[PDB]
Ligand binder design. Structure first.
Ligand SMILES: CCCCCCCCCCCCCCCCCC(=O)OC[C@H](COP(=O)(O)OCCN)OC(=O)CCCCCCCCCCCCCCCCC
Ligand SMILES: CCCCCCCCCCCCCCCCCCCC
Ligand SMILES: CCCCCCCCCCCCCCCCCCCC
Ligand SMILES: CCCCCCCCCCCCCCCCCCCC
Lengths: 54, 467, 100, 162, 129
């Protein structure tokens, strides 16, 4: 049961999480300019809202 | 208040760069000679670099309602001048293969260096805005220099539209701030204040949006891999080094000299932006097969580390020297890496197993890849150690945890590139040799100041502005 | 006698309309037109800010704003002429070959 | 003075809205001219006579070259309007509309939270602006000249046919 | 005072009467005179023969480079407009700043002239030989 080294896979879990998160985040770099301007506007709204709530 | 001759003595790099801009213009108009205008640009940049000594012998003075000159401005002026000199040195062998005119490149580089110097000396909102635009516009020219190539035109259009939008955002936030306070000076933001008022906070948020675009900060970071890949390699070198150095220097000047830096909400949103920038920039470069996009995400992560060093400026007094040391190390490492990329891309026509045909460039590239990872015996480790010490001193535990995680991810992809340099793959002109010497001295400086960092600490701490 | 808030609200309305024209429009010429609208709106906000305090700083910032506007308009117009010359259309969503 | 400012502001808002939601490029340029005329009227009502003067002086030439480039490429009859119409869809414009609305209401919340004393409408002549421009603000003028030179060099380098 | 509101009213009446007079003569021109009917009345005038294509073709203006230079030079002109109204109070130092500004302006103009820009005429129309 232990010959697969379960603790090694348990500690390799965050490497899989990092790979999945990086592959998910790379989908945002589609290369479209209008999406880039929309994302800049989204970030401006987000930072302004965070400044208003505090 | 009027202009004294001592003010022009302190104004030596700006006047020298403007004079050599005019001289390069007139020499281009007289005759299209690549070597003559290139030598003129290098001579002017070196003249500004050695006039920094006379600026230091003059002293620190508030030369304009706009400008203030001290060791801070001196250090950042020297950094952007070194970046511009390396950009010209890498650009000349690349420009040897350009079928079109090769003379406007050095003019645009000199004008962008002038904008960087004016950003380093900025103590006014108007100077800050003008320096940002004077960095951006020659970068619009240089990014789309090879407009026959598709990707350069793509990066030029994207950078121009996005930077015009960010300039509009920054200018609107500037106008809201000026409506709140009534003075555009860097020391009179909120002097009439109850430091939290929504109009000033919104104006500073919009300037944060603009500067975070200019510093490749999340979520205004999506342009960085595209613009870095599309642009020519010396242009990528300049955009990675000089623009980031100058804009972060003026950001630190704004956040140090203003009383608005004591506000908790701006510090909280800057911590959020720094966390997101580090994690996103490190995670996005995991599966990158292209070196330019990988270095763009690297720039995002390193600017996140600089953000972490900047957030704790109000609490500790050692944050500014940490940013100076990190920016010196980052400048040298980016110069070496992008110089190896540029020398591999020169001359312009239109890295696996690099050691077996170009061993010295492979050595420089793997040294700079070790340096960018924060590994000891290199300068990037000294910068990361300074950032971690600054974060620990002001008790920013989420930020230092993000720094550790991002450093591990950067370790993975940087060392992957480093071993790929030494696997098995399936010039002859003194300008190329000069570029090789430049990247070799960059690697040697990184190694020597990683082993023995104390002289760099002494030079950085001696660059002390008005507290 | 004229509220500063109404002028700032007018400038904000023009700025967000320029950004709406920047994002939702696909032809590059209308993105440049929207960029002109935002830079004029930020300049307008600077003039209202300078007129509230009775200073020339807002007008000088307006001058710098429209100098930047003219220079960026010329640069974007040259880039758009290049795009139309080497592509024969002004679709900005086809500029997407650089991704990932 | 309130009447002129408010009417010009309403005209500017309406003309900008008609600019960003139009398919005809020449009509869009005409509404842009109307909007900038209204902006200059707003400038004139606030006492900044030089600002409105430069808004009509230098943007009449700016939109003129925009008309030149519109004639150069965009005019093709009804085909260009038809092509521009397909790019605009109800979902396409309803997407960022709520983003622009929430940004506008956040900025309005920020604006209303500041103190007010009213703009007195005292005129500011071009003499004072010239004194401040070539007085305390030397380097803004000189490096703005260098910035415009840089933009001119970029325009020459990019805009060449061959 | 009274002179200022009198001048404002005079200017407003000048605008109103000018626009109304233009509209009135346009209406009088449109309403007076009988109309003409012809088979080829609603055809663009092209010297008496039908057109090839239409007049809505895209036309490559050769002076577009000069146009995007003209915007920049217009902004330099506005800077000199701002300077020229306050020469006496600017002093000799302000004259030095404007001399540097204008010297950069002619340096850019000589650069534009010498590199082949501001010259879009064809080789057959350059009046050589
Ligand atoms: C529809 C047609 C256009 C409607 C809008 C423009 C006209 C509005 C009515 C203006 C009537 C006159 C008026 O209200 O003048 C007030 C003010 C006079 O100037 P000022 O010296 O500032 O006032 C203090 C006087 N002791 O006036 C000012 O300060 C400036 C007045 C406005 C600017 C001049 C007109 C601009 C027209 C823009 C047209 C846009 C396209 C249509
Ligand atoms: C072919 C590619 C087309 C790209 C079009 C991009 C359009 C983006 C529209 C974004 C609209 C956002 C509306 C608000 C969402 C919620 C708030 C922001 C996220 C938290
Ligand atoms: C299987 C054989 C592999 C041979 C690798 C040789 C590597 C030599 C490296 C020379 C120094 C480069 C810089 C190191 C830091
Ligand atoms: C992936 C990044 C993970 C970062 C974890 C940071 C944890 C910080 C905990 C701080 C606790 C402070 C208590 C007072």
């Amino acid at each position: 049961l232990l010959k697969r080294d379960p603790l090694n896979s348990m500690m390799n879990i965050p490497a899989v999480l990092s790979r999945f998160a990086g592959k998910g985040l790379l989908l945002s770099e589609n290369g479209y300019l209008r999406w880039y301007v929309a994302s800049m506007s989204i970030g401006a709204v987000v930072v302004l809202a965070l400044l208003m709530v505090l | 208040m009027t202009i004294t001759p001592q003010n022009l003595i302190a104004l030596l790099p700006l006047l020298i760069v403007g004079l050599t801009v005019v001289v390069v213009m007139l020499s281009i108009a007289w005759r299209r000679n690549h070597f003559l205008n290139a030598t003129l640009s290098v001579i002017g940049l070196n003249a500004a670099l050695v006039s920094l000594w006379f600026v230091g012998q003059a002293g620190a003075m508030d030369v304009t309602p706009l400008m203030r000159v001290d060791g801070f401005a001196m250090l950042y002026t020297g950094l952007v001048l070194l970046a511009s000199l390396a950009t010209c040195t890498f650009a000349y062998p690349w420009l040897e293969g350009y079928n079109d005119n090769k003379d406007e490149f050095y003019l645009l580089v000199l004008i962008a260096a002038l904008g960087g110097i004016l950003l380093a000396n900025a103590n006014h909102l108007a100077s800050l805005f003008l320096g940002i635009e004077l960095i951006s516009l020659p970068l619009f020219g240089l990014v789309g220099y090879a407009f026959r190539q598709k990707r350069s035109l793509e990066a030029s259009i994207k950078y121009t539209i996005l930077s015009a939008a960010a300039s509009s955002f920054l200018l609107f936030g500037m106008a809201l701030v000026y409506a709140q306070s009534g003075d555009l000076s860097f020391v009179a933001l909120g002097k009439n204040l109850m430091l939290n008022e929504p109009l000033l906070l919104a104006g500073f948020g919009l300037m944060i949006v603009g500067l975070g675009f200019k510093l490749s900060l999340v979520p205004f970071h999506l342009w960085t891999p595209d613009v870095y890949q599309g642009a020519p390699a010396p242009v990528s070198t300049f955009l990675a080094t000089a623009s980031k150095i100058a804009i972060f220097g003026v950001v630190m000047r704004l956040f140090l000299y203003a009383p608005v830096g004591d506000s908790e909400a701006i510090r909280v949103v800057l911590a959020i932006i720094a966390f997101a920038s580090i994690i996103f920039g490190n995670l996005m470069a995991l599966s990158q097969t292209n070196i330019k996009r990988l270095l763009g995400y690297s720039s995002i992560s390193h600017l996140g580390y600089l953000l972490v060093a900047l957030i704790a400026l109000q609490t500790g007094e050692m944050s500014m020297e940490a940013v100076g040391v990190y920016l010196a190390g980052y400048l040298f490492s980016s110069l070496g890496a992008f110089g190896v990329v540029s020398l591999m891309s020169s001359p312009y026509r239109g890295y696996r197993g690099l050691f077996w045909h170009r061993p010295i460039l492979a050595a420089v590239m793997t040294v700079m890849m070790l340096s960018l990872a924060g590994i000891p015996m290199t300068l990037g480790f000294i910068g990361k150690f300074y950032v971690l010490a600054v974060g620990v001193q002001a008790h920013l535990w989420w930020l230092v945890g993000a720094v550790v995680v991002g450093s591990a991810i950067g370790l993975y992809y940087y060392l992957r590139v480093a071993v790929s340099l030494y696997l098995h793959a399936p010039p002859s002109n003194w300008q190329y040799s000069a570029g090789g010497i430049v990247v070799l001295i960059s690697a040697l400086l990184v190694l020597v100041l990683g082993v023995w960092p104390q002289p760099l600490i002494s030079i950085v701490r001696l660059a002390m502005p008005l507290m | 006698m004229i509220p500063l808030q109404h002028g700032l609200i007018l400038a904000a309305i023009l700025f967000v309309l320029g950004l709406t024209g920047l994002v939702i429009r696909r032809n590059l010429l209308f993105m440049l037109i929207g960029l002109e609208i935002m830079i004029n709106a930020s300049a307008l906000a600077f003039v209202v800010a300078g007129s509230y305090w009775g200073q020339t700083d807002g007008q000088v910032m307006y001058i710098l704003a429209i100098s930047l506007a003219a220079a960026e308009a010329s640069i974007g117009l040259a880039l758009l002429l290049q795009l139309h010359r080497r592509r024969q259309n002004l679709n900005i969503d086809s500029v997407s070959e650089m991704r990932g | 003075m309130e009447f002129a400012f408010y009417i010009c502001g309403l005209i500017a808002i309406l003309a900008t809205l008609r600019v960003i939601t139009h398919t005809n490029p020449v009509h869009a340029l005409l509404y842009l001219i109307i909007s900038l005329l209204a902006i200059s009227g707003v400038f004139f009502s606030l006492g900044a006579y030089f600002a409105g003067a430069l808004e009509i002086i230098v943007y009449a030439g700016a939109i003129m070259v925009l008309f030149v480039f519109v004639v150069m490429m965009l005019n093709l009859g009804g085909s260009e309007i038809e092509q521009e119409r397909q790019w605009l869809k109800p979902q396409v414009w309803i997407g960022p509309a709520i983003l622009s609305a929430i940004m506008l209401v956040v900025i309005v919340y920020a604006i209303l939270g500041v103190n007010d004393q009213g703009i007195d409408g005292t005129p500011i002549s071009a003499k004072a602006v010239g004194i401040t421009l070539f007085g305390p603000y030397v380097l803004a003028v000189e490096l703005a000249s260098m910035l415009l030179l840089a933009g001119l060099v970029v325009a020459f380098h990019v805009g060449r046919e061959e | 005072s009274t002179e200022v509101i009198a001048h404002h009213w005079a200017f407003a009446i000048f605008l109103i009467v000018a626009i109304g007079l233009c509209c009135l003569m346009l209406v009088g021109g449109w309403f007076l005179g009988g109309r003409a009917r012809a088979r080829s009345k609603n055809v663009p005038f092209e010297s008496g023969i039908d057109s090839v294509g239409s007049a809505r073709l895209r036309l490559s203006a050769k002076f577009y480079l000069v146009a995007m230079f003209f915007v920049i030079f217009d902004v330099e002109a506005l800077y000199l407009f701002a300077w020229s109204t306050s020469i006496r109070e600017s002093g000799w130092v302000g004259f030095v700043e404007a001399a540097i500004f204008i010297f950069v302006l002619l340096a850019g103009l000589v650069y534009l002239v010498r590199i082949g820009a501001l010259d879009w005429t064809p080789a057959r129309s350059r009046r050589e030989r």
